[model samples]
Target: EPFLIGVSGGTASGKSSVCAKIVQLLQKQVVILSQDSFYRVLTSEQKAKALKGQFNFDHPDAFDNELILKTLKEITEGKTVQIPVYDFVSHSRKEETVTVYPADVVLFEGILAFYSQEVRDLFQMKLFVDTDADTRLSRRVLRDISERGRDLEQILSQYITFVKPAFEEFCLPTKKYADVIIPRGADNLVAINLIVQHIQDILN
Candidate 1:
């Protein structure tokens, strides 16, 4: 059977970097399914509200988990899946979705990857990347401004307005689901090595 690992953490805590290293080290065609890629496109009214920092993006309703589940089901069953290419800058799905066949390893990383009990139950190994709150805040600010093209003020407003509180209310609660909790996220080499080793064992 193909293997599945679920990795989760707060926004910009380096979840993708860890996933990348694991895929590279294991030399597997790993499919990275990001929860951010599942964020629902905002309506015009919602876009305006988001501009005003009034959108409740950190809430569970912000993601289309149904589609995510369906995509994962197909990919794990050795079928090619069209993983939606979501654009954070435009806050919408791009016309070109990524088509990927089932891989020797499949990694799913997201802020809310394990927020759902059903999702949590799907992982062969589950990880929660634990970075300091300050680190997360700093990374989020930089990523939103530079990569996603949002300005500092908007990033600050959104973090203060939605991200922090939601982390407290929901994200932190799912940490217990993690088989491993990695400190300093992707910078932890030992943790990454162990994760890679475990994935290799599962693949064998």
Candidate 2:
């Protein structure tokens, strides 16, 4: 079986960057499964709310946990799985899917990667990326503006209305479940290197 790593953190806390760094430095076969891709298909009413930045994307209900569990289980068992392609702009899933082949390492990253007990149990290593609220807010604003087609006003409003509260209520509490907690976010090369060493040990 492949080493299954669960990467959890606050929104825009550098979870993706951490995973990317590991994959690059490991120089081994690695596949990443983003929890963003498991967002539930939004209904028309939900989509309408999302357009005005009124949707609570950080809420637990925003994701399809069941699908996430099933996909992780399948992929970790070395089976090919079709992962949904989500469109943040439309607040909907694209009709297309990305087929993932099992690899030596599998990284599942998200805001709520440790939320569900069953899903948490699937990970051999659980890494939590801890960054300050300010950094997360700044990164989120930049990312939403550049990639998600969000405006500064809309991004800030969402941060104040939903993002901040949800991180406090839902995301932070899950830190206790992490096998490793990384402070200073993804730029912590020392920590990243240590984790890579551990991963190599496990792979051996």
Q: Which candidate has the top score in lDDT?
A: 2
Please give, for residues 1-204, the per-residue lDDT of candidate 1 as tens digits. 568899988888889998887777775676777888888877899878876667878887899988877777776678877878888776777778887876877889998899888777777889999999888889888888889888888888888989989988888888989999999888898989988887777667
- Model 2 clash tally? 0
Location of the lowest summed lDDT over 10 successive residues in candidate 2: 22-31
Tell me the TM-score of each prediction against the true structure.
0.95, 0.97
Candidate 2 on 1-204: residue-level lDDT in tens? 988999999999999999999887785688988999999988899899999999999998899999999999998789988999999888899999998987989999999999999999999999999998898888899899999998899889988999889999999999999988999878999999999989998888
Residue 133 displacement (Å), model 1 = 0.9
Runs in model 2 deviating more than 4 A are none
Evaluate candidate 2 by giving its C-alpha RMSD to the native, one decimal.
1.0
Q: Which candidate is the best by TM-score?
A: 2
Q: CA lDDT of 118 in candidate 2? A: 95
lDDT score, candidate 2, position 142: 89
